[PDB]
Design a protein around this ligand. Structure first.
Ligand SMILES: [Mg+2]
Ligand SMILES: [Mg+2]
Ligand SMILES: [Mg+2]
Ligand SMILES: [Mg+2]
Ligand SMILES: [Mg+2]
Ligand SMILES: [Mg+2]
Ligand SMILES: [Mg+2]
Ligand SMILES: [Mg+2]
Ligand SMILES: [Mg+2]
Ligand SMILES: [Mg+2]
Ligand SMILES: [Mg+2]
Ligand SMILES: [Mg+2]
Lengths: 177, 116, 50, 136, 79
RNA sequence: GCCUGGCGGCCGUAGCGCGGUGGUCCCACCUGACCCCAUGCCGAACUCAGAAGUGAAACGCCGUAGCGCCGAUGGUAGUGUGGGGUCUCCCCAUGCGAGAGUAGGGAACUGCCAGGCA
RNA sequence: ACUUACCAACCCGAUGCAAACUGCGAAUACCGGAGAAUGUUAUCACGGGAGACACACGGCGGGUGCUAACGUCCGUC
RNA sequence: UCCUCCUAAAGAGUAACGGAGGAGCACGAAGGUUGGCUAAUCCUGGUCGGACAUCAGGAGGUUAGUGCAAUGGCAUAAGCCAGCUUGACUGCGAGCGUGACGGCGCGAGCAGGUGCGAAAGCAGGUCAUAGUGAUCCGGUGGUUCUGAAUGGAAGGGCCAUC
């Protein structure tokens, strides 16, 4: 909400003036933020997967999706159609809500001295990192939970290149360093 | 992308109708307008057409791109097909769901008298 | 060839029946279907499927 | 002895040997030895002919082998009746048509390549001739 | 080891062109088990459960190649 | 006359790549979505109510021979019939005549209906 | 944590081979239609009577054998 | 005994104690219909996680997949997911393919009744080709066909089935 209209007014002007875009549309936007855990211990028991789904629902709010195995790889003794991970792709108002609750409070708690990697782009404009610590977001208490499994986020953007993506993410509060 | 997916959706019926050899009512829906036309069994000549891009029909509504305009265009197609005398047309959804605005137009024509 | 042969008996008073096969260990529950009865000329339920 | 690493099938039909060779030009080296008749060419023969010229030039120039034994040849034991299935593979052979280039050499003088190919032809069963790279 | 044991009765490949049978729907004008390169051209009724083409009523049988992928269809000229 | 949308003919000389260009209309993006409808979660897709803004993406059009594609003439291989030879293979008379490759071509053409612009 | 007198996948260029390979592709043969001539209907259907089901060699295309056999097993004359 | 490929000489067919592999099943959904979807593999980025699990993007365009051996097919999908369902219906069937015969196979369309779909339409099992055994003898159910003086019954016939 606040960051939605903040991208609308200002921010967009910063990028426009920086990259001398002819059209407003050339400025990169943000479409989705994908949450992914992929515990992988489901081969031991299904309760771990259920607990993982509950934990990720705590952050997301509605429900997570369970992802099945695309192949029966013998190396990880996985069977086709065996749920081994959970995921969410929030979008729109909920997306901006989670982005606010993330940037405002969670990121400062994530190793203020480091924050995250500045070079974490794929090459097109995507921007992803692993929280590795599901206690940061505190929405839900963690003095009762059993495991401290991690978490991964990936921001998708329509940026042409990594330079454009990095400029857009800099325009926000993402400290990078 | 989306257009290619729609064509992929519609191909099977599109040509099953020609295999059966019947005149087909084809509808093309856009966010701003809607078109309908009766295509002959050979699929080369158009017998009747009507949309929201003409002065008539489009000058007597609120906004082209709603179910009311779809019903108006369906009425137009039904009346013009009846004038030409063609009957027993096969409606095709052209890859669109039948429940949306395409529900109208079809309903309007079948109540007008076109044998859906 | 563990699959065995069973007969589906019309629920109507007619003695007409069909024959088919089913697995005993995998689905021991009785099979219920709706098939045409040539004697009464109607679709009726069928039972007697071990 | 040269032979394929793996075989899709272990036995093959006899087949015939008709027509002219396909690769008839000196492509890799500067001098070549090309057949004039038709017939079989075994791995043992190819290996002996290779040694002939390789030792004729000792350590000089480069040598290419253009032919390769591809089809297997079967043979049933001595005191065995006719029939009772096909024989068992004993050796590998290469079918060669007239005009097929067999060996090539680059880094040697003509007056030495000629003698090396003469020695190799002495071993080969089919008659051959000496050819030059020339141009198109 | 082991030989012989070859299947028998590979049926048929081609049963005619033009007005060879003509009358009624026929049961030829198809390479059974083929499908590819022999499709129903609409003029003749579709395949059977075993991929067998046949006519509607009458007419000459013709072969054409049309459409994407350059597939061959069999049609019948109604008369 | 052009420009656009829909339905066809044909099925790469009709494709791909690179550069340029298009917004009156149309098209696509595009705003919201308590509802009709929907996500194995998400108005991403499907769907509904609209027209503030932009031709950026996509799409249409123009140029370009980098690739794909098409492709002679001639020769060669093979082959039906008749005849011949040192006959595991060939030759002659006659008829048919490739594949590959070379010169070269090539940045599609076309029918109907509807709309913008004369 | 560097080195490599070592080997080597994929990819690119050139060069061959395949009954169980094909992005190509004949000559013949076969199916169907029209036409002239020729042929003692040479074609088909029904009915009475049979014989025969050990084949041989030569040419062409092949499997097997050693492209050995007056060997052996197929297709066609 | 049955199925797939080559031998097999570009219609079909074609032998050898010739060269290679499979079958003697499975499914009440793995069938019908409606709606929707598209693969393998590689590269880049990211906690456990790594050569390979899951996530995002980009190459690639079927090298993926099919209940089972091989061939031929399949993007329209015959491949993948979901809703409702029992057409894996009954009596017929012009016409045709393949067999010495017994027989086997494909089949539009008609009558009755049924399922899916808004409708046009589709459905008489499964992408197709293997998953099989004649006759006799007898067993089970139905029948109002026969019933050795007459009325019954026994036995027999007919239909389904073992
Ligand atoms: Mg005999
Ligand atoms: Mg004989
Ligand atoms: Mg003999
Ligand atoms: Mg044949
Ligand atoms: Mg032949
Ligand atoms: Mg014979
Ligand atoms: Mg199936
Ligand atoms: Mg469907
Ligand atoms: Mg299916
Ligand atoms: Mg199958
Ligand atoms: Mg009595
Ligand atoms: Mg009785």
């Amino acid at each position: 909400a606040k960051l939605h209209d903040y991208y609308k007014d200002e921010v967009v002007k910063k990028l426009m003036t920086e990259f001398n875009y002819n059209s407003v549309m050339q400025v990169p936007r943000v479409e989705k933020i994908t949450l992914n855990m992929g515990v992988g211990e489901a081969i031991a028991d299904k309760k771990l997967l259920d607990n993982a789904a509950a934990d990720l629902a705590a952050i997301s709010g509605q429900k997570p999706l369970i992802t099945k195995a695309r192949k029966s790889v013998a190396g990880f003794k996985i069977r086709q159609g065996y749920p081994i991970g959970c995921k969410v792709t929030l979008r729109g108002e909920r997306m901006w809500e989670f982005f606010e609750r993330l940037i405002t409070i969670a990121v400062p708690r994530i190793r203020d001295f480091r924050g995250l990697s500045a070079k974490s782009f794929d090459g097109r404009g995507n921007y992803s990192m692993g929280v590795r610590e599901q206690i940061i977001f505190p929405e839900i208490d963690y003095d009762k939970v059993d495991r401290v499994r991690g978490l991964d986020i990936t921001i998708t953007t329509t940026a042409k290149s990594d330079e454009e993506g990095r400029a857009l993410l800099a325009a926000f509060d993402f400290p990078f360093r | 992308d989306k257009k290619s997916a729609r064509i992929r959706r519609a191909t099977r019926a599109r040509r099953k109708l020609q295999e059966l050899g019947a005149t087909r009512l084809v509808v093309h829906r856009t966010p701003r307008h809607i078109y309908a036309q009766v295509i002959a069994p050979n699929g080369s000549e158009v017998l009747v057409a009507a949309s929201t891009v003409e002065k008539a029909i489009a000058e007597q509504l609120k906004y082209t791109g709603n179910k009311d305009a779809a019903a108006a265009v369906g009425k137009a197609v039904a009346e013009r097909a009846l004038e030409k005398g063609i009957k027993d047309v096969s409606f095709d959804r052209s890859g669109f769901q039948y429940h949306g605005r395409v529900q109208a137009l079809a309903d309007a024509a079948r109540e007008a008298g076109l044998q859906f | 060839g563990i699959r065995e042969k069973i007969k589906l008996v019309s629920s109507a008073g007619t003695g007409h029946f069909y024959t088919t096969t089913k697995n005993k260990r995998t689905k021991p529950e009785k099979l219920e279907l709706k098939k045409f009865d040539p004697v009464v000329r109607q679709h009726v339920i069928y039972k007697e499927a071990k | 002895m040269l032979q394929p690493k793996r075989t899709k099938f272990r036995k093959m039909h006899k087949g015939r040997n008709r027509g002219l060779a396909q690769g008839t030009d000196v492509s890799f080296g500067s001098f070549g030895l090309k057949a004039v008749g038709r017939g079989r060419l075994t791995a043992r023969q190819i290996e002996a002919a290779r040694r002939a010229m390789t030792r004729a030039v000792k350590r000089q120039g480069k040598i290419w082998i253009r032919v390769f034994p591809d089809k297997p040849i079967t043979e049933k034991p001595l005191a065995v009746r006719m029939g009772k299935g096909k024989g068992n593979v004993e050796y590998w052979v290469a079918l060669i048509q007239p005009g097929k280039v067999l060996y090539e050499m680059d880094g040697v003088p003509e007056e030495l390549a000629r003698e090396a190919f003469k020695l190799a032809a002495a071993k080969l069963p089919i008659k051959t001739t000496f050819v030059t790279k020339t141009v198109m | 080891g082991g030989s012989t044991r070859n299947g028998r009765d590979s049926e048929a490949k081609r049963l005619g062109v033009k007005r060879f049978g003509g009358e009624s729907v026929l049961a030829g004008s198809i390479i059974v088990r083929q499908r590819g390169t022999k499709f129903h051209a609409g003029a003749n009724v579709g395949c059977g459960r075993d991929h067998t083409l046949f006519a509607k009523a009458d007419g000459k049988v013709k072969f054409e190649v049309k459409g994407p992928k350059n597939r061959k269809f069999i049609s019948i000229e109604a008369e």
